[PDB]
Design an enzyme around this catalytic site. Structure first.
Site, PDB file in Angstrom:
ATOM      1  N   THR A  41      84.330  85.572  52.679  1.00  0.00           N
ATOM      2  CA  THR A  41      85.493  86.166  52.005  1.00  0.00           C
ATOM      3  C   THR A  41      85.389  86.227  50.495  1.00  0.00           C
ATOM      4  OG1 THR A  41      86.684  84.028  51.937  1.00  0.00           O
ATOM      5  CG2 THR A  41      87.102  85.522  53.832  1.00  0.00           C
ATOM      6  N   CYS A  73      96.673  82.892  54.222  1.00  0.00           N
ATOM      7  CA  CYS A  73      95.446  82.169  53.925  1.00  0.00           C
ATOM      8  C   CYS A  73      95.716  80.800  53.296  1.00  0.00           C
ATOM      9  CB  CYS A  73      94.602  83.009  52.954  1.00  0.00           C
ATOM     10  SG  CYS A  73      93.042  82.231  52.632  1.00  0.00           S
ATOM     11  N   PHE A 112      96.198  88.171  51.169  1.00  0.00           N
ATOM     12  CA  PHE A 112      96.050  86.862  51.847  1.00  0.00           C
ATOM     13  C   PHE A 112      96.903  86.722  53.104  1.00  0.00           C
ATOM     14  CE2 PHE A 112      94.661  86.172  47.473  1.00  0.00           C
ATOM     15  CZ  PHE A 112      93.366  85.629  47.685  1.00  0.00           C
TER      16      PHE A 112
HETATM   17  C1  HEM Z   1      89.271  86.190  48.581  1.00  0.00           C
HETATM   18  C2  HEM Z   1      89.084  85.343  49.598  1.00  0.00           C
HETATM   19  C3  HEM Z   1      89.944  85.259  50.874  1.00  0.00           C
HETATM   20  C4  HEM Z   1      90.738  86.187  51.449  1.00  0.00           C
HETATM   21  C5  HEM Z   1      90.997  87.632  50.999  1.00  0.00           C
HETATM   22  C6  HEM Z   1      91.345  85.613  52.638  1.00  0.00           C
HETATM   23  C7  HEM Z   1      92.190  86.295  53.481  1.00  0.00           C
HETATM   24  C8  HEM Z   1      92.855  85.723  54.549  1.00  0.00           C
HETATM   25  C9  HEM Z   1      93.798  86.392  55.423  1.00  0.00           C
HETATM   26  C10 HEM Z   1      94.189  87.876  55.271  1.00  0.00           C
HETATM   27  C11 HEM Z   1      94.215  85.508  56.356  1.00  0.00           C
HETATM   28  C12 HEM Z   1      95.261  85.764  57.488  1.00  0.00           C
HETATM   29  C13 HEM Z   1      94.492  86.207  58.743  1.00  0.00           C
HETATM   30  C14 HEM Z   1      95.400  86.588  59.911  1.00  0.00           C
HETATM   31  O1  HEM Z   1      96.627  86.777  59.726  1.00  0.00           O
HETATM   32  O2  HEM Z   1      94.821  86.788  61.027  1.00  0.00           O
HETATM   33  C15 HEM Z   1      93.548  84.242  56.060  1.00  0.00           C
HETATM   34  C16 HEM Z   1      93.712  83.087  56.786  1.00  0.00           C
HETATM   35  C17 HEM Z   1      92.997  81.927  56.591  1.00  0.00           C
HETATM   36  N1  HEM Z   1      92.024  81.684  55.627  1.00  0.00           N
HETATM   37 FE1  HEM Z   1      91.489  82.992  54.148  1.00  0.00          FE
HETATM   38  N2  HEM Z   1      90.888  84.311  52.757  1.00  0.00           N
HETATM   39  C18 HEM Z   1      90.037  84.053  51.692  1.00  0.00           C
HETATM   40  C19 HEM Z   1      89.393  82.874  51.425  1.00  0.00           C
HETATM   41  C20 HEM Z   1      89.504  81.737  52.208  1.00  0.00           C
HETATM   42  C21 HEM Z   1      88.857  80.474  51.914  1.00  0.00           C
HETATM   43  C22 HEM Z   1      87.945  80.225  50.686  1.00  0.00           C
HETATM   44  C23 HEM Z   1      89.196  79.609  52.897  1.00  0.00           C
HETATM   45  C24 HEM Z   1      88.798  78.127  53.106  1.00  0.00           C
HETATM   46  C25 HEM Z   1      87.670  77.599  52.621  1.00  0.00           C
HETATM   47  C26 HEM Z   1      90.067  80.325  53.820  1.00  0.00           C
HETATM   48  C27 HEM Z   1      90.596  79.804  54.991  1.00  0.00           C
HETATM   49  C28 HEM Z   1      91.532  80.398  55.775  1.00  0.00           C
HETATM   50  C29 HEM Z   1      92.175  79.765  56.924  1.00  0.00           C
HETATM   51  C30 HEM Z   1      91.968  78.345  57.501  1.00  0.00           C
HETATM   52  C31 HEM Z   1      93.164  80.761  57.432  1.00  0.00           C
HETATM   53  C32 HEM Z   1      94.116  80.545  58.607  1.00  0.00           C
HETATM   54  C33 HEM Z   1      95.380  79.931  57.983  1.00  0.00           C
HETATM   55  C34 HEM Z   1      96.371  79.595  59.072  1.00  0.00           C
HETATM   56  O3  HEM Z   1      96.729  80.525  59.855  1.00  0.00           O
HETATM   57  O4  HEM Z   1      96.777  78.395  59.160  1.00  0.00           O
HETATM   58  N3  HEM Z   1      90.221  81.609  53.361  1.00  0.00           N
HETATM   59  N4  HEM Z   1      92.688  84.439  55.009  1.00  0.00           N
END
Ligand code: HEM
Ligand SMILES: [Zn+2]
Ligand SMILES: [Zn+2]
Ligand SMILES: [Zn+2]
Ligand SMILES: [Zn+2]
Ligand SMILES: [Zn+2]
Length: 454
Positions: free
Chosen positions: A267, A399, A392
């Site tokens: 990401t 996220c 996010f």
């Molecule tokens: C620019 C970087 C990033 C973007 C654009 C991004 C984007 C997103 C998005 C759109 C979701 C929601 C997905 C859904 O609704 O199905 C999400 C969930 C998540 N992301 Fe990211 N992410 C990024 C970086 C990261 C990083 C660096 C980590 C951890 C090291 C991370 C961990 C997670 C986790 C664990 C979820 C699930 C949260 C939950 O539902 O409890 N993400 N991300």
């Protein structure tokens, strides 16, 4: 009741073959441009509705009415990411339990403790580029990926992948990437259990085992040492859910670690790569950002507070997330029979997919210049309507890594702008590769040192 448009169907597979490509999100963006704010998409025994306008998406984001769905893609990723945060249902025991336990480790406050190890990897990136010969170039997504993966390895469990020292990816990485590829490729197979896919399934197991073995072993080793390295693994081993008093079990901890490594690899590296792309294509904006970096980043070792002062670099990152949100789609289901937009009746369980790139190109919100790169859009956060900007995700299922990603990206893009001038020597033509996420394939630049020591 308004009827929704529907793209062309291709036999019993209905609409599925339109997504049987290396660039399915870009295909869906084209369909959205053709059909408008909502279209129906059929697969055998499934109907999904794809949403593109802020008018409809704001309603989809009402958590009292709609909850996160696991798309088929996420169900296949779940084969190795298990009931980790990203591939769990909201109502599943380990979702709330891991959410409560981990939230404090991802807060803006937590970033103060991760900052030093983020700087450790960033300095390695800068030194690499300082050491290239005059005739050499930078492979941008490749180096951004080395940085973001190594940074989460260090912050996640105090492990050095040493990606800036190696020819071939550490063997865990090789296996994770191949697993993610198989997961996405499975979506396109008409007959999954045809003999030609046998070597795929054997490879899939070998890979999953390469992953669990680094990880189950890393967890058992830490449990045995009792070493209190101040990282995500320590917090998962020691933390107790206040709602239940229970800690995460070792199996769930493995899934969370795999999940963070996937996110680290996929990401933030995409964001950094898109950001550098838009800067080399908009030199005046690059100069404005480089001027901020030079003014603010006056220590060879940048501090947490200095990164917070990089306001214009933050605007550049948000505008890159506007045009190319690197995790571009998320899935929701109707919690009960309901009506969307005053016009589209839904049955309980019906899936809605939000196309974030389309949301971010809604001219009714952003004005007529939506396709242009203009960070100054973000000068006043109050001017951005609720649910207009969603790189996010949404609500409690947004996220968890947002603060981590933005701190890392702002730090790294700031150091890049401090230390080098950049040349788009090939006049690069944007080519977006799709894995779990979006990244600019083949993007190369030359970096001329500004000769500032660190
Ligand atoms: C620019 C970087 C990033 C973007 C654009 C991004 C984007 C997103 C998005 C759109 C979701 C929601 C997905 C859904 O609704 O199905 C999400 C969930 C998540 N992301 Fe990211 N992410 C990024 C970086 C990261 C990083 C660096 C980590 C951890 C090291 C991370 C961990 C997670 C986790 C664990 C979820 C699930 C949260 C939950 O539902 O409890 N993400 N991300
Ligand atoms: Zn090359
Ligand atoms: Zn890789
Ligand atoms: Zn701690
Ligand atoms: Zn019903
Ligand atoms: Zn214009």
């Amino acid at each position: 009741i308004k009827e929704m448009p529907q793209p062309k169907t291709f036999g019993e597979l209905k609409n599925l073959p339109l997504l049987n490509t290396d660039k399915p999100v870009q295909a869906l963006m084209k369909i959205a441009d053709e059909l408008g704010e909502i279209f129906k998409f059929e697969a055998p025994g499934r109907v999904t509705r794809y949403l593109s306008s802020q008018r409809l998406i704001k309603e989809a984001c009402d958590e009292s009415r709609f909850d996160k769905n696991l798309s088929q893609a996420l169900k296949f990723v779940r084969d190795f990411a298990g009931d980790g945060l990203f591939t769990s249902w909201t109502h599943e025991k380990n979702w709330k339990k891991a959410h409560n336990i981990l939230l404090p480790s991802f807060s803006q406050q937590a970033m103060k403790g991760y900052h030093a190890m983020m700087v450790d990897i960033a300095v390695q990136l800068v030194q690499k580029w300082e050491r290239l010969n005059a005739d050499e170039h930078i492979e941008v997504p490749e180096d951004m990926t080395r940085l973001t993966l190594d940074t989460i390895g260090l912050c996640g469990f105090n492990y050095r992948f040493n990606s800036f020292y190696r020819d071939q990816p550490h063997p865990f990485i090789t296996s994770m990437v191949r697993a993610l590829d198989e997961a996405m490729n499975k979506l396109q197979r008409a007959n999954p259990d045809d003999p030609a896919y046998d070597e795929n399934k054997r490879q899939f197991q070998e890979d999953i085992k390469v992953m669990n073995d680094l990880v189950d072993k890393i967890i058992a080793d830490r449990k045995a040492s009792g070493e209190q390295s101040d990282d995500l693994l320590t917090h998962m081993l020691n933390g107790k859910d206040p709602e239940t008093g229970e800690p995460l079990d070792d199996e769930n901890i493995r899934y969370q670690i795999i999940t963070f490594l996937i996110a680290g690899h996929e990401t933030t590296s995409g964001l950094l790569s898109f950001a550098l792309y838009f800067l080399v294509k908009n030199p005046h904006v690059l100069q404005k950002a480089a001027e901020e970096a030079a003014r603010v980043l006056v220590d060879p070792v940048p501090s947490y507070k200095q990164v917070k002062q990089l306001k214009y670099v933050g605007m550049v990152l948000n505008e890159a997330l506007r045009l190319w949100p690197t995790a571009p789609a998320f899935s929701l289901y109707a919690k009960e029979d309901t009506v969307l937009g005053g016009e589209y009746p839904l049955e309980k369980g019906d899936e809605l997919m939000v196309l974030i790139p389309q949301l971010h190109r809604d001219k009714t919100i952003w004005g007529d210049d939506v396709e242009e790169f203009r960070p100054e859009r973000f000068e006043n956060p109050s001017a951005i309507p609720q649910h207009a900007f969603k790189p996010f995700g949404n609500g409690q299922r947004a996220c968890i890594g947002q603060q981590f990603a933005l701190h890392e990206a702002t730090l790294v893009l700031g150091m890049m702008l401090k230390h080098f001038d950049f040349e788009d020597h090939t006049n690069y033509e944007l080519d977006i590769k799709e894995t779990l996420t979006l990244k600019p394939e083949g993007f190369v630049v030359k970096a001329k040192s500004k000769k500032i020591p660190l």
